[PDB]
Amino acid sequence: EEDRLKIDVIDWLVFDPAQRAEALKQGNAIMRKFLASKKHEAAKEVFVKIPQDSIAEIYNQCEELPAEDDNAIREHLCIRAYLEAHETFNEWFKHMNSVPGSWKGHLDALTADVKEKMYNVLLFVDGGWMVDVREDAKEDHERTHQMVLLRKLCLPMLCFLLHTILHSTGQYQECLQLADMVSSERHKLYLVFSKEELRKLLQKLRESSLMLLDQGLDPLGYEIQ
Amino acid sequence: LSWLHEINSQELEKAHATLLGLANMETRYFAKKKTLLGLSKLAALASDFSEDMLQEKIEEMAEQERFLLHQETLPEQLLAEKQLNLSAMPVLTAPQLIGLYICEENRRANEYDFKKALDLLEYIDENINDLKLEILCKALQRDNWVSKDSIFVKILLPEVKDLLQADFEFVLKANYEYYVQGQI
């Protein structure tokens, strides 16, 4: 009710090119809300309303950038990176079950591709996903709160999608190196995991060391000697 | 290899324990060491350790993670050139890593690389001053006397040498003068 109004408005904010940063910001706000409630299509619908050129557009209204606008952009890219991660997983998944030599060939392409989209989000450049790169922005506690929650909401999920993808296709050594990734002090992905999820993660990797031992390799997938 | 079982049993204080131990004996594969330690740290985090006992453990692993950072951050080209398995080489020692960070073969070497090499002295564990020199001299050579300057501004001192270092001297003293005003 209060939400349907805002998104109906995105259509008007996208009208005037001179107010393109505002579209971007207000578009981000909604999707931050959607994604907070796991509503991936809800968010994807708002997304497609952004003119897919709106960023080159903003850069042209400057060429002289405001923190808030610099962030709206990074955040918009984040939210994109995140939707692509899920759509490619859907695609990959479909294919892992179609089961009709061009097939496997396309399968490795998908596996290799979703792997990348996942890592894109997990190790999002220069700060990480839903993390502002600009501190001089005007105080906004609601946004800051929301962004901190999305890292807790969406980040661990992708970690598990990622393990699956890797295990599902025998990349078991890489599965165990998720341990490297999550505990890395570079990103501290670990401090957005609940103890419940860290356990879940640990137990999934066990399944992966069993599969490695099953091949005459050590639990981490290395040779014995 | 009890850690595998200690996990399925939810004995994570214990799986962290064996895991941390294996992590220390690891010398054959850096990548294996890395993983085991990451694994060790996850176990600790996901266990029921005391809020301080925990912060005490993640305290000391941040310390080891601080050392593997040096070998971790070895230039991919330097590696591509010594033709070393991206991730199948062994856990090097500090002597070895300085050789690399100091290796003339490392072209793109700048203050950071030499910086890294210097901090590595503290990880030697029993002549340290000789290296300290060898690594310092080699920073100027790449600068063709910028960088030896920058390495000093970063350290921001009586450990460095002057008269004995020299053992074109015009600028050496110039900096060994700007150093006076700096250290004092």
UniProtKB/Swiss-Prot annotation, chain A:
Subcellular locations according to the entry: Nucleus membrane; Nucleus, Nuclear pore complex; Chromosome, Centromere, Kinetochore
GO terms, biological process: female gonad development; mRNA export from nucleus; nephron development; nuclear pore complex assembly; nucleocytoplasmic transport; post-transcriptional tethering of RNA polymerase II gene DNA at nuclear periphery; protein import into nucleus
Function of the protein: Plays a role in the nuclear pore complex (NPC) assembly and/or maintenance. Required for the assembly of peripheral proteins into the NPC. May anchor NUP62 to the NPC. Involved in nephrogenesis.
Alphabetic keyword roster: Acetylation, Centromere, Chromosome, Disease variant, Epilepsy, Intellectual disability, Kinetochore, Membrane, Methylation, mRNA transport, Nuclear pore complex, Nucleus, Phosphoprotein, Protein transport, Translocation, Transport
Organism classification: Eukaryota, Metazoa, Chordata, Craniata, Vertebrata
Substitution effect: D132A: In NPHS11; decreased interaction with NUP133; changed localization to the nuclear pore with relocalization to the cytoplasm
Subunit structure: Part of the nuclear pore complex (NPC). Forms part of the Nup160 subcomplex in the nuclear pore which is composed of NUP160, NUP133, NUP107 and Nup96; this complex plays a role in RNA export and in tethering Nup98 and NUP153 to the nucleus. Does not interact with TPR. Interacts with ZNF106.
One GO MF term attached to the UniProt entry: structural constituent of nuclear pore
Entry's family note: Belongs to the nucleoporin Nup84/Nup107 family.
Official protein name in the record: Nuclear pore complex protein Nup107
Entire protein: shown range: 666 to 924 of 925
Swiss-Prot record, chain B:
UniProt source species: Homo sapiens (Human)
Quaternary structure annotation from Swiss-Prot or TrEMBL: Forms part of the Nup160 subcomplex in the nuclear pore which is composed of NUP160, NUP133, NUP107 and Nup96. This complex plays a role in RNA export and in tethering Nup98 and NUP153 to the nucleus.
Tissue: Widely expressed in fetal and adult tissues. Expressed in the brain and kidney.
Protein name: Nuclear pore complex protein Nup133
Clinical note on disease: Nephrotic syndrome 18: A form of nephrotic syndrome, a renal disease clinically characterized by severe proteinuria, resulting in complications such as hypoalbuminemia, hyperlipidemia and edema. Kidney biopsies show non-specific histologic changes such as focal segmental glomerulosclerosis and diffuse mesangial proliferation. Some affected individuals have an inherited steroid-resistant form that progresses to end-stage renal failure. NPHS18 is an autosomal recessive, steroid-resistant progressive form with onset in the first decade of life.
Family: Belongs to the nucleoporin Nup133 family.
Protein's job: Involved in poly(A)+ RNA transport. Involved in nephrogenesis.
Subcellular location: Nucleus, Nuclear pore complex; Chromosome, Centromere, Kinetochore
Effect of L121S: In NPHS18; loss of function in nephrogenesis; unable to rescue morpholino-induced nephrogenesis defects in Xenopus
